[PDB]
Write a structure and sequence with these properties.
Chain lengths: ~240, ~120, ~90, ~55, ~375, ~375, ~90
């Protein structure tokens, strides 16, 4: 299959979290939320992530309650059955930008921006692909590449033609912690955030993994030594034959 | 497959000096490559015994060849379970690797063949 | 319970093997044995002697197939490249 | 070893002694891992990012 | 007589796990069986516990699983353990089957044991497919579609059998809700099939690497294999632990993280790894009916072995040509799976077909020919008349 | 030797359903056994088929059941069969238990047989209650509530066990979804429990109405009891059909056709007819804890029977005082179940208490006291030393 | 297979009973018998006599119980009517 169709293979960047002993960089996760809220959130939903899940991971109980209350959600109708709204609460899920699919495609040349809750896991490459796709938008398609109106070229996406334009540009976000919001510094962040969104069990999982592998390893070694001991009698056993008269 | 069959094909080869000079070497090498002699076993000890014919044979085997065979088999299992090979001098030397059970097998086979034939013999008036 | 069909295995005392006579076995208690050694010094050069015998029945086939795959995989990579696009059109449909 | 003969005196470890020890382990072992793990990831954890705030 | 011996219940145990006469020489390959037993338990248990959070509904399906993934405490461990357990179930099963071919476990008086085993193999592949559908991700829906459609190949009633399975005009709510029920049911049938497998094993005992009678030297299953099975049990767990905690989705497919969509089959659609060699075979025949018949044949041809094996000795330990060709078979199986993974492109198609040939040829031509040749080789190599 | 005898699988079938030596004199009460086997199948088959349409989700639960009634072809036949099959299961189970209780089947070497049977009773009641919750009707919800709360009686960990089961602050979605999950699982355990009941039966064979040994005159199970069993099978189906087709809801409660509601327990709440006697025993004790201890005790007390029956002969066929007191127990049991359907009002409360006393007093006082007297009575009535 | 405990029932040929001698049974093929009559004329006035003996053992207990229920059942009815709103207020709390 022609490489243009397979897509350019995403390179292996050094993620602070790649490693059996490594946790996510919650500092980066936090900045990630911001890059999402100011740039990505205008076209992408995060339907599977409930507000409360940020508490104790990237922000504080107050900070989340505050981000949540800025949105209205449907509440139980009043005395006479009149539908009324309500400010968001921790038990809620991050609201999407479009009320339905038809409306999402209307605002996107006919295309549909996938919900980014499991994007890192729904693609080969994961962090490396998401990150590479974000940063690798060449200012101009290679020679001979005729592009469909309203489309954009990006070598990493399969077929090279992608409906999403480029959105990350230097200094477009003002990082709270004073970090230079360069177009790549951001990509690194949102990606990390999107990774936690898809794999929240992360840190907790690798920790249990360490307990498990240690214990089972010991049980394995111990078991070999025990087996040999029990089998010793049979292993060393000797036979002598004397043909009966 | 029957030994009456194996012994048929085999002898024919063993008789015509053309096939003989060409196959016997391959066969000798095939056998030394098999590795059973290295476990103190004769080929006949390898014959799968879970059938009437073999069962018939083994019973008809003279007491001494039987006790001997018994030992050889046990020895094989002990060695195999220890993952070693018997000390080189205990290996069955090709001259000992005799088809001791075979005659009994063939006898039993043909005996069965007949019983089988006489059970379905047609009549012609 | 009624009687069932004869098998090729009994149970302790009547396993159904040949009458054994003459074979004598000796064994020792695991308690009275060297706290698990044998590994290294005596059975280290003994280990891996197996799969040094067998490794050919395994290697030759592996080689034959891994070679066949690789070779065939490169021809794929070529056909769909710029260079082979002329030959690709030949053998495709 | 003479360390076994003082503690258990040539008798295998008892099933009650096993369980009892099994509990101790659970807590001891866990805290050890949790600590090594948190320390190794210092600066990345929420506890650490929460302080810089 | 001892209680374990006299008691109605305990005795069944005593004669299967405690006093059961084993051949002193059975190696670690004989440990595959207990491992498959463990897989069944793990699968069954992790499954029942997830069922407590799952929703058969086509709408709630994928989300309920994601609910198990996020909201259920230790949920992810249950899912990653079920999911990776299935893959390990197949790895160990193939090995158990391989041990069978190599050591000629299929012949001798153990035929019925083999035949029951094959049934289990068919039942498991079915069970796993049904389960894979419950996630209802892209790979789920399309796999559900393609596989139920295998039956449209049946001459007349064919399309009826299909819309009957679906319970509609296409794979929909009825199909998922029913496939969940079926997925719950079959495992118990498998357990049932496992006892029969054990019953047949129990009359003739297990075999050994030499391929000869073990009756001359046995050692009780207990205080030997109970401890030896334990070595491989722990290892089995360790290696699974590694995937479940440090590499949970390596054995899976990414598309199964995008909900199913009836109007779009991903260009990257690819079967689960353990189904590939079979998928590869069907793909090699350029006709609908034949592709499916040839595929089922690829599974059923396993039944033909106790007859094509012309050898007079059991197992490959002392056969040279056998060992070699046996290994030509194993790798050819791997190459076949490797093929199913690639696209339908020029160098690969012809390869798939040749490999398919080899596969079937091993059972119907190679084994019967080589076994005959080796029989004579054995005779003329020591006979002087 | 014949095949039905020599084959590993048919020999089992043979020694259980074909060649099995039966006592020539066993009456029709011995037909209840196979009836229960049939019941287990009817429940299991009907259930799995209905499961393909069921949704355990609390918001969808009740409606999926109606979807079965209204949209699924023969869905109503499936539902009415399952529901009524559930009641018949108990009408028969009770008879099966009674026959044994009468003929002293719980005695001699058959205790383990009886003890296994008691477990199956506890398990069946459990399975049944799990399934009743799945409709999520008013009775469902409140049955779910009260019963799980039975455990809040346990002193320290109480409430914890309860909220653990619920999986929430109260009976909600988590509860109904894990309850379906478990309602599917237990039946298969019951099935296993049955095979043990059978193994325990098979070593001593059935008893007989005379209560003496049947070794002198045996007749094979096949072509006698296979056909005798057929008579009751049909008779059984005939009456179950009368209910399923002409009176499907007579054995039920109307409140269950109203969707469950957490804020209103209907003033018409009444347990399923087969649970009433036990419900009654619990209501008869004005203490929360003692109420549940006594109720559970009323079930466990059946294990006591092989020790309190001091008689030197088995069965009630020849005991005047026992036959009398047996029926006093039977009717008392019915009265108990009647008090249960009644209100907690003046004459009924005291009645319930007097009967509860009788119930327990039967196994603990009457039987031992009576049988001792009969032993002596049997002696002096013919001894002239 | 291994042995099992001694039960109180064997199988055909060794059922585990006492040695029988002197008992001779005779029987005729169901084929040589009248096309299933019995009931009416021979076994019609023989039946129900097998619940004429037992009848008193069931009936009395059933009697004692039905009376007890019906009786106290009427008392409930009375208590919860005007006629007994006084008796009720007395025997209630
Ligand atoms: C609306 C104008 C968008 C903004 C702002 C961002 N995205 Fe987007 N995205 C949009 C479209 C039209 C699509 C469809 C692409 C297609 O042709 O299928 C997408 C897609 C993505 C994807 C999926 C890529 C794939 O493999 O299909 C990703 C990972 C993605 N978008 C990421 C992303 C991020 C992190 C953004 C904020 C920096 C972002 N998008 C903004 C439209 C729009
Ligand atoms: C209810 C009992 C239950 C049993 C028993 C069970 N499963 Fe599942 N299985 C589930 C549930 C629930 C899911 C859906 C959630 C999930 O994906 O884990 C599932 C999903 C699966 C999947 C999808 C894998 C994934 O998670 O992507 C496979 C494959 C599978 N089962 C295999 C098996 C096999 C093989 C067995 C063993 C016979 C088995 N299951 C037994 C409940 C069960
Ligand atoms: C999944 C398989 C399945 C099995 C196995 C099963 N059931 Fe059910 N059962 C259901 C379903 C689905 C319902 C809900 C629909 C209904 O009410 O019939 C149900 C409902 C019930 C009900 C509620 C009665 C009512 O209102 O319909 C009872 C009682 C019941 N089951 C008893 C049993 C008993 C007793 C057994 C076993 C001996 C059993 N079930 C086995 C699936 C099953
Ligand atoms: C078609 C292949 C096949 C399948 C599939 C199969 N088995 Fe076996 N099994 C056999 C044969 C043949 C033997 C005898 C092997 C021998 O000892 O030579 C056997 C033996 C066993 C043994 C004894 C240990 C051993 O490995 O020899 C157990 C236990 C067992 N199988 C369990 C299972 C379970 C559990 C499953 C599946 C859930 C399973 N088997 C599936 C063919 C199969
Ligand atoms: C509380 C006890 C108890 C319960 C509940 C019970 N059984 Fe039994 N069962 C017995 C006893 C005791 C016998 C022996 C009676 C005899 O033959 O004298 C018996 C015998 C049998 C028989 C032989 C035929 C007969 O009726 O004598 C079968 C079959 C049987 N039971 C099946 C079952 C099944 C199936 C269930 C339920 C799913 C069940 N039993 C539940 C006590 C019980
Ligand atoms: C209620 C039960 C029902 C209706 C039927 C179930 C039984 C069917 C089987 O046998 C057990 C079946 C599993 C089969 O066996 C012949 C396997 C080898 C499957 C082979 C298989 O898999 C695929 C798969 O997984 C896919 O996913 C993405 C996609 C696929 O196309 C691209 C396939 C496919 O093309 C084939 C042949
Ligand atoms: C996953 C399994 C779990 C959590 C637990 C199940 C096990 C419990 C049982 O035994 C198996 C249980 C069924 C019990 O046994 C003592 C039965 C006799 C039932 C007794 C019972 O029923 C009622 C019922 O049905 C009702 O309907 C609306 C209402 C009820 O009052 C309002 C009752 C009730 O007051 C009692 C005591």
């Amino acid at each position: 299959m022609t490489a243009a169709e397979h897509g350019l293979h995403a390179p292996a960047y050094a993620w602070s979290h790649n490693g059996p002993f490594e946790t996510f960089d919650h500092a980066s996760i936090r900045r990630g939320y911001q890059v999402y809220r100011e740039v990505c959130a205008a076209c992408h939903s995060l339907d599977r992530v409930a507000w409360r899940t940020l508490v104790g991971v990237s922000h504080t109980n107050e900070e989340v309650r505050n981000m949540a209350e800025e949105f209205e959600y449907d509440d139980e109708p009043d005395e006479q059955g009149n539908p009324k709204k309500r400010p968001g609460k921790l038990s809620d899920y991050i609201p999407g930008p479009y009320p339905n699919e038809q409306a999402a495609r209307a605002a996107n040349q006919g295309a549909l921006p996938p919900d980014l809750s499991l994007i890192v896991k729904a693609r080969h490459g994961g962090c490396d692909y998401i990150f590479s796709l974000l940063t690798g938008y060449p200012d101009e398609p290679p020679a001979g590449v005729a592009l469909p109106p309203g489309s954009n070229y990006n070598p990493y996406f399969p077929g090279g033609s992608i409906a999403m334009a480029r959105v990350l540009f230097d200094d477009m976000v003002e990082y709270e912690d004073g970090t230079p919001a360069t177009t790549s510094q951001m990509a690194k962040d949102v990606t990390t955030f999107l990774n936690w969104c898809a794999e929240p069990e992360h840190d907790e999982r690798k920790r249990l993994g360490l307990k498990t592998v240690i214990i089972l390893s010991s049980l394995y070694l111990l078991s070999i030594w025990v087996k040999k001991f029990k089998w010793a009698g049979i292993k060393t056993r000797k036979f002598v034959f004397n043909p009966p008269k | 497959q029957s030994f009456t069959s194996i012994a048929r094909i085999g002898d024919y080869i063993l008789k015509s000096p053309v096939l003989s000079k060409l196959c016997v070497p391959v066969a000798n090498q095939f056998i030394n490559l098999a590795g059973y002699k290295k476990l103190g076993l004769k080929f006949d000890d390898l014959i799968a015994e879970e059938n009437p014919i073999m069962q018939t044979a083994l019973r008809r085997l003279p007491e001494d060849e039987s006790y001997a065979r018994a030992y050889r088999i046990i020895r094989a299992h002990q060695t195999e379970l220890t993952h070693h090979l018997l000390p080189r001098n205990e290996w069955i030397k090709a001259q000992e690797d005799v088809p001791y059970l075979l005659p009994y097998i063939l006898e039993a086979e043909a005996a069965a063949k007949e019983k089988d034939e006489l059970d379905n013999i047609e009549v012609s008036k | 319970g009624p009687p069932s069909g004869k098998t090729y295995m009994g149970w302790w005392g009547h396993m159904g093997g040949p009458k054994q006579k003459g074979i004598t076995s000796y064994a020792v208690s695991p308690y009275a044995q060297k706290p698990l050694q044998g590994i290294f010094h005596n059975a280290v050069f003994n280990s891996f002697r197996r799969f040094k015998s067998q490794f050919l029945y395994v290697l030759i086939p592996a080689g034959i197939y891994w070679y066949w795959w690789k070779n065939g995989n490169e021809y794929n990579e070529f056909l769909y490249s710029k260079a082979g696009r002329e030959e690709l059109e030949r053998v495709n449909v | 070893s003479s360390l076994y003969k003082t503690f258990f005196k040539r008798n295998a470890v008892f099933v009650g002694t096993i369980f009892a020890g099994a509990f101790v382990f659970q807590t001891v072992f866990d805290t050890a891992i949790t600590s090594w793990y948190e320390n190794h990831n210092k600066g990345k954890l929420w506890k650490d990012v929460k302080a810089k705030i | 007589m001892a209680f374990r011996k006299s008691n109605v219940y305990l005795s069944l145990v005593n004669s299967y796990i405690i006093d059961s006469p084993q051949p002193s020489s059975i190696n670690y390959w004989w440990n595959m069986g207990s491992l498959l037993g463990l897989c069944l338990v793990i699968q069954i248990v992790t499954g029942i516990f997830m069922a407590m959070h799952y929703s058969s509904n086509i709408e709630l399906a994928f989300s309920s699983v994601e609910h198990i993934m996020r909201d259920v405490h230790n949920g992810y461990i249950l899912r990653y353990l079920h999911a990776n357990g299935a893959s390990f179930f197949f790895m160990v099963m193939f090995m158990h089957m391989a041990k069978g071919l190599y050591y000629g476990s299929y012949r001798s008086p153990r035929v019925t044991l083999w035949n029951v085993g094959v049934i289990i193999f068919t039942l498991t592949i079915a069970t796993a497919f049904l389960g894979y559908c419950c996630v209802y991700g892209q790979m789920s829906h399309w796999g559900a579609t393609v596989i139920t459609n295998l039956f449209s190949a049946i001459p007349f009633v064919g399309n009826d059998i299909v819309s009957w399975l679906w319970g509609g005009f296409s794979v929909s709510n009825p199909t998922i809700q029913r496939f969940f029920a079926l997925h719950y049911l079959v495992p118990f049938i498998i357990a049932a099939m496992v006892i029969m497998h054990l019953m047949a094993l129990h009359i003739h005992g297990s075999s050994n690497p030499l391929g000869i009678t073990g009756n001359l030297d046995r050692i009780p299953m207990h205080s030997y294999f109970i401890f030896k099975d334990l070595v491989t049990v722990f290892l089995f767990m360790l290696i699974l632990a590694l995937f479940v905690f440090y590499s949970p989705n390596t054995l899976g497919h990414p598309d199964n993280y995008i909900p199913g969509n009836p109007l779009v089959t991903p260009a990257s659609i690819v079967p689960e790894w353990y189904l590939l060699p079979f998928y590869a075979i069907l793909r090699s025949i350029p006709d609908k009916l034949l592709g499916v018949i040839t595929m089922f044949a690829a599974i059923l041809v396993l039944l033909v072995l106790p007859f094509t094996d012309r050898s007079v000795v059991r197992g490959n330990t002392f056969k040279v040509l056998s060992k070699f060709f046996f290994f030509i078979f194993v790798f050819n199986f791997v190459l076949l799976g490797q093929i199913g993974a690639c696209h339908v492109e020029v160098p690969y198609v012809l390869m798939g077909q040749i490999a398919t040939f080899i596969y079937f040829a091993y059972f119907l031509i190679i084994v019967p020919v080589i076994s005959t040749i080796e029989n004579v080789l054995f005779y003329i190599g020591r006979v002087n008349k």
